[PDB]
């Protein structure tokens, strides 16, 4: 596309600049361009891809939630205000779905199939789960069940690899488990599964902290605290 004429390294450089400038739409476009060069991504480059799209979709999700809340209130004693709330919620929703589809497209063409190391494959499968989960957040139709199942299937594949190939303190493994637990609680109507996963993940990570350097310890304990925060919220 539009980034076809720019060097891979220049796209990566500009993604980093865009991050510094809090220009996340630009950052995402640069990283899409980099992915479309066809080479595999390093860990740092996967981080750039992740940060860019998370920030873009994060803003869309926040906006969608505001508009959905206004829409719900409109449908309670409420005075008729016409189609505008629904239309605008739909506009934001369509854009959000578009971003999710873009990310899923990159993963399918061809990041996942070329990812053979545990860190890359688990990261990409987690990402696939996450973006299906974001699609599930706004789904209501004939397809909501299939979207949920797609998220589940991606997370489960990631989980299976992570358990076999990574230590329990690995940040990617931990972040995957965190997000899959959120899936269970928020999407799949499975709070007990969520709690069980968060508890087991936390406990197995705790038991492996002794193997870590000071820096790795910092990384693992940060995510462990998020598991604990959710457990506190959920129980």
């Amino acid at each position: 596309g539009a980034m076809g004429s720019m060097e891979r390294a220049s796209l990566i450089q500009k993604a980093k600049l865009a991050e510094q400038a809090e220009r996340y739409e630009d950052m995402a476009a640069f990283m899409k361009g980099a992915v479309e060069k066809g080479e595999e991504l390093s860990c740092e480059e996967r981080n750039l891809l992740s940060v860019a799209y998370k920030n873009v979709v994060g803003g869309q999700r926040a906006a969608w939630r505001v508009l959905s809340s206004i829409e719900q209130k409109s449908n309670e004693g409420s005075e008729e205000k016409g189609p505008e709330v629904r239309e605008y919620r739909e506009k934001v929703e369509t854009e959000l779905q578009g971003v999710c589809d873009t990310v899923l497209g990159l993963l399918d063409s061809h990041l996942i199939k070329e990812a053979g190391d545990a860190e890359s494959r688990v990261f990409y499968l987690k990402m696939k789960g996450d973006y299906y989960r974001y699609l599930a957040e706004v789904a209501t139709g004939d397809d909501k069940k299939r979207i949920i199942d797609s998220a589940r299937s991606a997370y489960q594949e990631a989980m299976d690899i992570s358990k076999k190939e990574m230590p329990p303190t690995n940040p990617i493994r931990l972040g995957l488990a965190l997000n899959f637990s959120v899936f269970h609680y928020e999407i799949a109507n499975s709070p007990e599964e969520a709690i069980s996963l968060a508890k087991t993940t936390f406990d197995e990570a705790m038991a492996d902290l002794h193997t870590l350097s000071e820096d790795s310890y910092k990384d693992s304990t940060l995510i462990m605290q998020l598991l604990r925060d959710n457990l506190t919220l959920w129980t």
């Binding site: 920030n55 965190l178 959120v182 995510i223 925060d229 919220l233």
Partner: peptide, 9 residues
């Protein structure tokens, strides 16, 4: 209150 998922780092 919403559950926390993995943040950016």
């Amino acid at each position: 209150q919403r559950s926390t998922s993995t943040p950016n780092v």
